[PDB]
């Protein structure tokens, strides 16, 4: 098993660091390939311009059409499929508009029903979808 000597520090620490790379989390965090392939790129939110409305078909047993929005980010130019949350919130979003997109919750997993969609729309033209649904604010254009 383990070397349990008194002069074995260098063996130990080196072994630890060597084995640390096999951890999925650590590697994801420290290799800097996931930080570069991430469209947000170490960002809480991003802001993009909507290109088209996309009706993404839901993953098998739950049968529906999840209404997404194909944004193109401003800060680099990557394309993203972003799910528009509450019902009838797709109607607020129009083509060629500023949209604040955020993560879904799982750091890069497709959340639940929607396949290959990691992002959700939070704001449309600097007003929140949460407000627009509840009828608290008006959307400018």
């Amino acid at each position: 098993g383990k070397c349990r000597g008194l002069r074995t520090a260098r063996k130990l620490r080196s072994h630890r660091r060597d084995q640390k790379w096999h951890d999925k989390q650590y590697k994801k965090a420290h290799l800097g390939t996931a930080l570069k392939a991430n469209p947000f790129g170490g960002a809480s939110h991003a802001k993009g311009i909507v290109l088209e409305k996309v009706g993404v078909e839901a993953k098998q047993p739950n049968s529906a059409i999840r209404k997404c929005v194909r944004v193109q980010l401003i800060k680099n130019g990557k394309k993203i499929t972003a799910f528009v949350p509450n019902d009838g919130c797709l109607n607020f979003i129009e083509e060629n508009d500023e949209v604040l997109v955020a993560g879904f919750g799982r750091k890069g997993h497709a959340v639940g029903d929607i396949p290959g969609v990691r992002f959700k729309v939070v704001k449309v033209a600097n007003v929140s979808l949460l407000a627009l649904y509840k009828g608290k604010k008006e959307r400018p254009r």
Binding site: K53, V54, V56, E57, C68, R70, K79, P115, G116
Partner: protein
């Protein structure tokens, strides 16, 4: 070559016949390696063109 080796065949006759089969196999595994790279190059580009659809160009509107 599909010739049964008769007993009366000696050196130069047997030796050239064996060297012909060696050259057939050498031509064969070059041809097999070429196909192994052809399928590998075609699978990898079709893997991209299928994974391209997952990200974009799949929906409704």
């Amino acid at each position: 070559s599909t010739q049964p080796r008769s007993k009366n065949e000696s050196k130069e006759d047997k030796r050239a016949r064996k060297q012909a089969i060696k050259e057939e196999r050498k031509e064969r595994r070059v041809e097999k390696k070429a196909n192994k790279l052809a399928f590998k190059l075609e699978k990898r580009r079709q893997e991209k063109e299928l994974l391209n659809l997952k990200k974009n160009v799949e929906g409704l509107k």
